[PDB]
Symmetry: C2
Subunit: 312 residues, 2 copies
């Protein structure tokens, strides 16, 4: 059953047969890396929920605050990136994840680590390195050598951790394929879906109004949900429906006035989907319910962080 | 006068005006790096002679046994490259060069060094990195990421040494141009000509018969000179004439039998050139003289190394 609980809401597992062999082990390990981000949003939360699934399946979890990778991906100076990392650690802990948190710079400048970067550089074609960064590399009119060092560094992190399982978004799949080719131990890769941003124009990100941050205030959640892309009857690419799929708890009741059908009890996401596609559920009522539900879902994260922020 | 003695037999100085300012300093420093090579040949010797010129001008000399660079340029395993480095050091010392010898791996895996590799990677375009390796990169049908790390590592070595002057062959000129753009202190670059191989097909190299090694035996020098490319009256691209230009001492007498003109006293390389172009000097006599002169020029290097090799 652990296999299906791990598989739930994933986009792919490379490969399922290898995962089942991993689940036979007495001790098993998984890791994920994040470039430190000033906002920790529902996209991050989706992946942390998967790490919690792995933890509940008996995995030891490592969270890599990949500040050296963010440095190579033009995220600023190294000292400021690590200060954002410190904050990210606090947010992940506030989410219920007990894990080991490691900074990429704590090990990623060691002599033996660096020597393996260069060894991997001897085996990785430029063509493969650049193709692996297509969905990852900060767009750039004059591409820099840092762009092809990045994927080898991410591969080397996997080698350093020695994990059975590497977790990430679907955009990581080419780097993970490189890791399965370059390293003696093939990591089992679990890929999570990429969440659509609130704007309805590509992935969720820190751009203004495009995200729900896990520590957003209730009025911010309502305002950003209210103006999100959400056409009537449209489910594909609809970020409000994706949030309902991946974060809400069912059954739930959608509160409606009497003229529009009154309260509506929804047994599951699939019933919610049926009602939205058939236009029995109006976008305005869908948004109100998703906002109020999200507020309740995220409240413990918010109040946990707020009590820390008072240093008390 | 030191300026002209340094300039003698160089291909270019970037720039001469900057060199003259360097010569005003009380203390001045120059370095050169070599990928360790199993044969140390006249091409190496030409560059060491230039380092000796700099030494006699009051420069402190650093010789970098660039084993980490050779590693990235597919020269084999790191341990075997450093054993060739050890031998190269002994040869350079046997040439009369008193200097400091440093292995690239002694400093080139330090945390602060590696961090500057990554900083430089952020500033170097892939296009510039690859173009700088055109004359340097081991030919490869599937170019590897190591190819673009190499030039940034060579630039970073220059930064680590802090030298006023960087010396190398003309093939290094693009990497040196990158160093002048990437580093806070602009190094003055002195480029030596590329010696034609004995085969007459490109640069001198370790391929069979294509080189005179400084520790070659007299019968090896005679045999390899005798079969070298050397068409009558042809000076351009003629490796025997280049050796006469760059290594022989003038005046010299060329021994000839009586039928062919008897002994011929040559006041300078320019007189030797006049006689060869006008076909007054036959290739056979030119080769005999260059071989016997080279034997005498290289003898001290040979006997110095041989006395070491007996461990006594």
């Amino acid at each position: 059953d652990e296999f299906e609980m791990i598989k739930r809401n994933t986009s792919e597992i490379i490969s399922e047969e290898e995962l089942r062999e991993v689940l036979k082990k007495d001790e098993k390990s998984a890791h994920i890396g994040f470039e430190p981000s000033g906002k920790i949003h529902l996209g991050h939360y989706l992946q942390i929920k998967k790490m919690i699934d792995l933890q509940n399946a008996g995995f030891d979890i490592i969270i890599s605050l990949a500040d050296l990778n963010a440095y190579l991906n033009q995220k600023g100076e190294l000292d400021e990136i690590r200060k954002i990392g410190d904050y990210n650690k606090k947010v992940f802990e506030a989410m219920g994840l007990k894990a080991k948190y490691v900074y990429g710079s704590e090990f990623g400048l060691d002599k033996d680590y660096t020597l393996n970067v260069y060894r991997l550089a001897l085996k990785t074609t430029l063509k493969r390195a650049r193709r692996s960064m297509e969905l990852i590399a900060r767009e750039d009119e004059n591409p820099k050598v840092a762009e092809v060092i990045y994927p080898i560094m991410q591969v080397n992190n996997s080698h350093y951790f020695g994990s059975d399982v590497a977790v990430g978004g679907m955009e990581q799949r080419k780097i993970h394929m490189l890791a399965r080719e370059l390293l003696p131990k093939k990591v089992v890769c679990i890929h999570n879906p990429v969440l659509t941003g609130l704007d309805g124009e590509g992935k969720m990100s820190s751009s203004k109004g495009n995200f729900i941050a896990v520590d957003d205030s209730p009025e911010e959640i309502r305002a950003k949900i209210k103006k999100a892309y959400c056409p009537a009857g449209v489910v594909e690419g609809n970020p409000i429906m994706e949030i309902a799929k991946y974060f809400l708890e069912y059954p739930l009741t959608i509160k409606r006035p009497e003229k529009f059908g009154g309260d509506l009890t929804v047994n599951s996401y699939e019933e919610l989907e049926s009602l939205f596609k058939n236009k029995e559920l109006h976008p305005m009522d869908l948004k109100n319910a998703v906002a109020e539900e999200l507020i309740k879902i995220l409240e413990p994260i918010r109040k946990r962080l707020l009590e820390h922020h008072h240093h008390h």
